[PDB]
From a paper:
We generated 12 structures of the F11 TCR, that recognizes a peptide from the influenza hemagglutinin protein (PKYVKQNTLKLAT) presented by HLA-DR*0101 (DR1-PKY), between 1.58 and 1.89 Å resolutions; 5 structures of the DR1-PKY specific HA1.7 TCR, between 2.31 and 2.98 Å resolution; and five structures of the 003 TCR, that recognizes an HIV-GAG-derived peptide (SLYNTVATL) presented by HLA-A*0201 (A2-SLY), between 1.26 and 1.37 Å resolution. Indeed, for the F11 TCR, we observed Cα backbone flexibility in the CDR2β loop, shifting by up to 3.6 Å in different structures of the same protein. In both cases, these shifts were comparable to loop movements reported in several other studies in which the unbound and pMHC-bound TCRs were compared. Moreover, we also observed loop movement for the F11 TCR structures, which were solved at an average resolution of 1.55 Å, comparable to the higher resolution datasets for the 003 TCR. For the F11 TCR, only the CDR2α and CDR2β loops were free from any lattice contacts (data not shown). Thus, the ability of the CDR2β loop to shift between structures could have been partly due to extra freedom imparted by individual crystal packing. However, several other loops in both the F11 and HA1.7 TCR structures were also free from crystal lattice contacts and did not shift between structures. However, we observed several CDR loop re-organizations between structures for the HA1.7 and F11 TCRs, while all structures of the 003 TCR were identical at the level of the Cα backbone. Thus, we conclude that these loop movements represent real differences in the conformation of the CDR loops of the HA1.7 and F11 TCRs due to the intrinsic flexibility of these regions. Although this analysis is an approximation and should be treated as such, the average maximal loop motion was slightly less (6.4 Å) for the 003 TCR compared to F11 (8.7 Å) and HA1.7 (9.0 Å), consistent with the structural data demonstrating greater rigidity in the 003 TCR.
Numbering used by the authors:
A (entry chain B): 1 to 240
B (entry chain A): 1 to 202
């Protein structure tokens, strides 16, 4: 069908019941929930062949499901724990293995919401030595001090999102690798011709979408409530 | 079909060389077989599948795979590796007449053909008026790899390849930074084997 899943992104505390919903329009008998984790592929949690039928997959522990209509297949984490943090995919199939996957649900289960923290973001300007040596200019963005590890970084030149000349680290690193709740950091590069960097009309912005607390959540600390938000940093081109 | 095996969670290919991602299965009756691709960070897209018709199945973008029951294989190939082929690929098989079971997946890393390497370590300053800085190791070829820091207050990223379309120009780089006031870019990458002709400006 158009297979659709809700929610798209969610952060939760441990101990809560969490509900993910898959919906379809084509009325295929067969629906499935899978989770994806790095190094393990897509593992089946549960599946259903019609409204009368539920069957366990390889990793059914900690989960329940309901098939309340031809069109709908719900997944619940009964009591969320951190090792249920994962990308979750629902799918439908016809009678000949024609699968349709939903676009995904990224779920992060954290022990203590007190540790949530938005990134600080900074842009570092191209070296004169690089410009002189290569006639190219590399900007570096650095996002630091964030938790959990649930961000999206993009670059914006004169207000349009750019993909050429970009490389972002595939995973953030731990600022304190000996701690279970270490904050994270992430870097990205955008490289342009020296020519383009040297033009003071050009505007360069690194944007980081952070996923955190919602308006709903209680917050007892003096520091800013660490809600879902965008944090950017910027630099202007420079002739001197 | 009771299993599907991909080996090597991460694999490399030279830019312009034959792509070959291996998949084998265990199932006495020939199964249906599937290859899916996933871009960061995006959903799954079907490349091709064997469904008991052609044994040589062609997919989008030059991809093909040959089903070979005599060696229980369904290897994915493409004649020439492009930088845009960087992604995660999953082999998958029919099971118990009711589902698809997925292999563990392999991430394909494309090594750029770097004809004129120009290794260098540059210092970059914060655009705002701290003088925080970071160090950028860049423009080294495929024989160089970056090591992890051996000091808990120095941070070093993995190497990353960017492709500047404006100049059809690809390059490697890693970033290092620290809050320690004795930290200098001259020493940032001392735990990596760097090229003998790395440029270190003043």
């Amino acid at each position: 069908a158009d297979v659709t899943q809700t929610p798209r992104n969610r952060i939760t505390k441990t101990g809560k019941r969490i509900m993910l919903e898959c919906s379809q329009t084509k009325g295929h008998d067969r629906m499935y929930w899978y989770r994806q984790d790095p190094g393990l592929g897509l593992r089946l949690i549960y599946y259903s062949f019609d409204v009368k039928d539920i069957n366990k997959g390889e990793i059914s522990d900690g989960y329940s499901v309901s098939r309340q209509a031809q069109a709908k297949f719900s997944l619940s984490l009964e009591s969320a724990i951190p090792n249920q943090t994962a990308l979750y995919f629902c799918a439908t199939s016809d009678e000949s293995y024609g699968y349709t996957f939903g676009s995904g649900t990224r779920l992060t289960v954290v022990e203590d919401l007190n540790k949530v923290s938005p990134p600080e973001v900074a842009v570092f300007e191209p070296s004169e030595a690089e410009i002189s040596h290569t006639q190219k200019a590399t900007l570096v963005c650095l996002a630091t001090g964030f938790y959990p590890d649930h961000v999206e970084l993009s670059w914006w030149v004169n207000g349009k999102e750019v993909h050429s000349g970009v490389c972002t680290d595939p995973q953030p690193l731990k600022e304190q690798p000996a701690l279970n709740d270490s904050r994270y950091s992430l870097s990205s590069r955008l490289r342009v011709s020296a020519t383009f960097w040297q033009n003071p009309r050009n505007h360069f912005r690194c944007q980081v979408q952070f996923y955190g607390l919602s308006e709903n959540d209680e917050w007892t600390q003096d520091r800013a409530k660490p809600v879902t938000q965008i944090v950017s940093a910027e630099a202007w081109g420079r002739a001197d | 079909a009771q299993s599907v095996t991909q080996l090597g969670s991460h694999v490399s290919v030279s830019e312009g060389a034959l792509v070959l991602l291996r998949c084998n299965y265990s199932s006495s009756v020939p199964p249906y077989l599937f290859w899916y691709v996933q871009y960061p960070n995006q959903g799954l897209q079907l490349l091709l599948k064997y469904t008991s018709a052609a044994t040589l199945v062609k997919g989008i973008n030059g991809f093909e795979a040959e089903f070979k029951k005599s060696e229980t294989s369904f290897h994915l190939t493409k004649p020439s590796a492009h930088m845009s082929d960087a992604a995660e690929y999953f082999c998958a098989v029919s099971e118990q007449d009711d589902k698809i079971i997925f292999g563990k997946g392999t991430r394909l890393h494309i090594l750029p053909n770097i004809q004129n390497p120009d290794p260098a370590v540059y210092q970059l300053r914060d655009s705002k008026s701290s003088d925080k800085s970071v160090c950028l190791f860049t423009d080294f070829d495929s024989q160089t790899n970056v090591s992890q820091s051996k000091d808990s207050d120095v941070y070093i990223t993995d190497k990353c390849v960017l492709d500047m379309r404006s100049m059809d120009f690809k390059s490697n780089s890693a970033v290092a930074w620290s809050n320690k006031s004795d930290f200098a870019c001259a020493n940032a990458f001392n735990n990596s084997i760097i090229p003998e002709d790395t440029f270190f400006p003043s």
